[PDB]
Design a binder for this molecule. Sequence first.
Ligand SMILES: [Cl-]
Ligand SMILES: [Cl-]
Ligand SMILES: [Cl-]
Ligand SMILES: [K+]
Length: 162
Amino acid sequence: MNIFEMLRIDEGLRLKIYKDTEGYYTIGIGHLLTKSPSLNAAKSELDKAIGRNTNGVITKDEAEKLFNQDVDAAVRGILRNAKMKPMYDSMDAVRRAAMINMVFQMGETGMAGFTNSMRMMQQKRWDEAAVNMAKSRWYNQTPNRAKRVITTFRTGTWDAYK
Ligand SMILES: [Cl-]
Ligand SMILES: [Cl-]
Ligand SMILES: [Cl-]
Ligand SMILES: [K+]
């Protein structure tokens, strides 16, 4: 297991534009296109992401390209950040992959409300952090994936993914 295989399992793969749990247009491996309700808008967004006239469908290779870009941007968002960088630096490889999963799904911005739980993590209060983490719109919206993620952060193992 690795961050790519983890996220691939959590995001799934869809070649046609679809709407996530909150109504937002997405495609490929969890690539959010837009928060707009207009499909047309999402379509534009896709052509710009891909660099071609797509009409809402992409190839697997294209999907994987956006995913490389997305994981890279996530890692970068962590690294760039003043509070997250340090938090990332202090974690083992497994917990580092979990945090990257979070950021990919929620962004630097979503991550901000997780400050306390992250801090708990830093203090080795796994269990507490975990319960805390489940108390979020994040978990509530997509509990299965969130449960995997939390488990990973909690334990430092890949059990949730086997
Ligand atoms: Cl993009
Ligand atoms: Cl690529
Ligand atoms: Cl590229
Ligand atoms: K997907």
